[PDB]
Amino acid sequence: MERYENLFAQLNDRREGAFVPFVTLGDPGIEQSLKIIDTLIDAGADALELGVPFSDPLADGPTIQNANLRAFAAGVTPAQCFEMLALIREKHPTIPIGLLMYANLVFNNGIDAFYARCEQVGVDSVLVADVPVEESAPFRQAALRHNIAPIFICPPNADDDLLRQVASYGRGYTYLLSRSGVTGHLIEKLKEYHAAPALQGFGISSPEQVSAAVRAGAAGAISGSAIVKIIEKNLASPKQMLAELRSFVSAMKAASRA
Amino acid sequence: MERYENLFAQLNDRREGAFVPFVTLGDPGIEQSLKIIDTLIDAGADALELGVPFSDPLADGPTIQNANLRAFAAGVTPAQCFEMLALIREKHPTIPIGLLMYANLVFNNGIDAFYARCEQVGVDSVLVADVPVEESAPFRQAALRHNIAPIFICPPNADDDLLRQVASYGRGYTYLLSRSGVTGHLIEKLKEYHAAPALQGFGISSPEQVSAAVRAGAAGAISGSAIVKIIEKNLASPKQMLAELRSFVSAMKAASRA
Amino acid sequence: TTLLNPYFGEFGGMYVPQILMPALNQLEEAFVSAQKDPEFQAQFADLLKNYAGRPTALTKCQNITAGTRTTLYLKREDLLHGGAHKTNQVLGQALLAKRMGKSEIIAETGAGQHGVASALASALLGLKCRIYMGAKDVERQSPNVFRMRLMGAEVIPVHSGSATLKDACNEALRDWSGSYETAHYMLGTAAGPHPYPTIVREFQRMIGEETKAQILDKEGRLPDAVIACVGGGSNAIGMFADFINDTSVGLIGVEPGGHGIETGEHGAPLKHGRVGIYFGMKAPMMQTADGQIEESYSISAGLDFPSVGPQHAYLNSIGRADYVSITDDEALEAFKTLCRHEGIIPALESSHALAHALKMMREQPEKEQLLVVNLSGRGDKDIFTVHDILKARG
Amino acid sequence: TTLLNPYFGEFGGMYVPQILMPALNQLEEAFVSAQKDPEFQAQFADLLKNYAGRPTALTKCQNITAGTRTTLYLKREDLLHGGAHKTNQVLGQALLAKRMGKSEIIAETGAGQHGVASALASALLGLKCRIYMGAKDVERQSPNVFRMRLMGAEVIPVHSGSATLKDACNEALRDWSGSYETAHYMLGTAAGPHPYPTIVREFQRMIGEETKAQILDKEGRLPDAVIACVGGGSNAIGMFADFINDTSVGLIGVEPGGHGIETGEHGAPLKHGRVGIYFGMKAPMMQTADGQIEESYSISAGLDFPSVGPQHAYLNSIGRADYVSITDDEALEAFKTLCRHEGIIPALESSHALAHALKMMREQPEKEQLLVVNLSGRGDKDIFTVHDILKARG
Ligand SMILES: O=P(O)(O)OCCNS(=O)(=O)c1ccc(OC(F)(F)F)cc1
């Protein structure tokens, strides 16, 4: 949580939005993934959203689906992901790190044990994709006990009741869905209820979309498939992959500045 | 009818039984069949039982079933059978000739027309295998109108009622079944009811069986499969086929003499 | 003599070798006795209800008749245990066999459906079942052959003749003509020598009886016509029977037209064959000019019987029932239509009946008519056949 | 909040992305309304009776229990339209979809049985049906795929993940999470996020209700135990439901043991799996030590669901119901036994239930017991599978 607070405070003083890229840990391999992440940060990423390879990402589109597939093909496990996370935090002490998880991987060895592990490696937030606010109690409680920000999703059709819940239960940032489906007004209400700063996600793949998000009042934007697409398109060229990632991220981040 | 009467009268004067072989007309071919028949007669056959190739001989065993198959393979038709019959009668004026038919071939172009054709070529009797006494009326009537003897089958389980019917309706000879199934006391009762002389059939394949039949009071015996077996066993040797047929028939006929 | 009339007008009779007459007389007597025996009727009703699943539904098909004045119902024999109407009569015949003190069953089968029905009834009632089937059908109906053996029945291939149904029919008789003392010949359709045409009709008449009660309950009146396919005639006569005396009810039998009557490749002996004497009866049949028995062709193996039940030939002669034909393509179209519009996969045999009903509806869409089609069986077994065709046609 | 409890003890819940909650809430509300609507109940009853063929028979199997003190009855869901119990609930769900004003149906399927059921219900009720199926199952279930298309349903292969049922389950959700406004997700078993476990049980409870009335009529008392196979849990909970409050009636669920529990190749998550959160619910499941979801193995594709309905996990926890497992070989033996002794070909799925009943009988032949086995489906579809095995074994 603290890292997000500091980040948003610093960005606000510069009148700029945050650009948060998403990538699957271990895709296409442990070593290359670590290089990809360092590149994203050196390119301008304000924060990171990192997925742990899961056998059934029912909230992700084809692009992300294959990202997990490549990660599994590399033998990447949750344990190895936490080792990567520890190292990433050791290299970058201030960048907020959020995980994109699926319930079973959190519940597996105990919900409390999972959040305790997140705190130990330096994770800042956790978004459990298949846990709606209605079932969030044990997850958000465990998160808060370990100084982890529980991230809630605010759908485009969210009603007043949901907005109030997301505003009171969420921390770090409020995930604002740009649409329905899977990966591939509300803002004013959230601020009125003192919700965590909003980051728009889903479908964000161009600089103009980042500028629009910030102009709409959002604190920033999240982009995943656009990032992952660059990875699967340059699998045969690791060096070219990083070069293209740096170019895309720098362009997206530039669009968030005032 | 007349030919059977004369035959049985002549055989009785010599205190001997009749030996009647059966063969399928046109098996294995028209020409060879005619030679086979002339051989059977020259060998001692007192009368003949001749089958007209039918698509479904449900009263015949494997041996006879294949006889019809070979006949059909030769393109033998009912019309060709009647031409063969005419010639056989032209060569042998006194030997009784009986046909083994299936109802459809008799009913096909008219029952009356069929018996009229039999009379025209010189046939003496007709046994319709799938026509029981219960359905025999139109057949026996047409037969009698054309001086053809209608042959009835007397099963081994026949009751008094059946014996009386067979005795009054039959002519030429009474077909005495030695058993049930298909190709492959009663005598005293038949004589008591003045039935046509009895000829035992089915399973007759040895000289001792012919002697036994006559000794039992029967006027003779009929043998088919035993004859047909000699044909299918010597298909590749037409000359040897006739030689073996002559030997078998002469042995069977000898057994009927006093 | 006999207890019941062996003839329906000029058709029918008992044209079997003399040796088999005692077997037929015994069977007729046992049947007559059974029909007056409350205990037999109770046992038969028990099996039909609790084992076979009777009564079967009478389904109103509103989707397929949209835009027309036709109201169509389908008698669901496809929901009967076994997937076809054959089950009704094999259960009855199995009981008759036991009534006569027999513990063995002899049966013939072409497509294999009757073989499967005989096998299941025999397994249920503790009878030793032996089935004759043409070699051409054995290799062409591997699934049904395995079903028969799974149920403990002995399957015996027949290579004689054309190695088909008619050939199996003969081999079965040959066997029975020498073992009728302990074995009963379970004939598979409303044909053959008396008393089979009568027995099969009576053991299938619950189809029509149920249909009458169901249609009266649902529509308050009798159908304008009941329609059924005709291979040998059992499901049709089963539907027709109880309506024969209801003069206002039309009876329509549908024979397979194959590639078209004019092509000569069909299975419609009643309207396009010639009367002959075969399989123990006098009836219309597929035969050459010389009188040799031929085979009936149809995309549906189940409608391959080269002849037809004598009561149908009789009902036709007096004008009480009308018979028509439906081609392979018309049956295929009906099959596809029922699948997509009612979610029911009909047997290709039954599809011939449905096809004619669809024609009655489509040719005169403004004609008010209440029709019942006897859906004699389900078509899961015809999936591959229909598939290969649609494929071979692009 | 919700109208009904989403949990059965600790099991169940609504673990789906936030975007899908409105769809679940809408569905729950429509279901609750429908259950109190006489018109809805009348329409559902009409379809079940006149289209599906309910009520199904309750068959007493006297042959298989000879020499023992066991009396066995089989609830004949194999006689239901479609050949399996699945038809009951798909009809109910199709009606719910129409009640909510939706004209499109989304479904997932592994063995293809649920896909076929969804397709037939959709064709009958005029709904546009689209079905997701794992590519591995598509090429392995060609027959069912053709049946689905014949009925107008669109079949979409899934190559993601292991390309099986679980993979199809995810793809279906992804689609619905962006079209629930005009499309209803017809889940195929008594599992998944609330209210599906509840809805499916209620749309399958006529199995148990009929069984109770039938057994009371025939035996004058309740069964000592009702036995059913458990893949996802729908046919089992359908049989169990009406007996839950009858404390004297044992409830036995049978999971597939595959090659044997100790081999690790099985499909028994309830008794040998580990509780996890997947497919929108908290329930026992097949998963790795790390929490990755695995596949369930069984000779019967229909029992391949890697998890189990939450109400079953709950009934087990409180001791109201007992769950056991049956191996491939035990199921195969039961399959062969029913075929030869009762003339009924059971689905390999159902054969697991029968196998356990046979064990209860055989292990204690002098124990007086009245048992009912839910014969969830027919096994004509399993003929080849059983054949290839018997062959590969000589
Ligand atoms: O650019 P895109 O469209 O690929 O979006 C990025 C996806 N990565 S992510 O961490 O934001 C993300 C976050 C929450 C998700 O599921 C939930 F909404 F159901 F909760 C799915 C993806």
Ligand SMILES: O=P(O)(O)OCCNS(=O)(=O)c1ccc(OC(F)(F)F)cc1
């Ligand atoms: O020696 P076999 O056993 O082959 O018997 C010879 C067969 N030829 S036949 O003309 O006598 C003959 C005569 C009548 C037949 O059928 C019927 F009894 F049903 F009427 C069958 C064969």
Ligand SMILES: *Cc1c(COP(=O)(O)O)cnc(C)c1O
């Ligand atoms: C056997 C069969 C038929 C044909 O026989 P009939 O005796 O003419 O009824 C028709 N439909 C089905 C489904 C069949 O199995």
Ligand SMILES: *Cc1c(COP(=O)(O)O)cnc(C)c1O
């Ligand atoms: C689908 C199926 C099953 C398994 O599903 P449940 O939801 O566990 O009932 C069992 N039996 C048959 C015949 C099936 O088709």
Ligand code: NA
């Ligand atoms: Na016919």
Ligand code: NA
């Ligand atoms: Na399971």
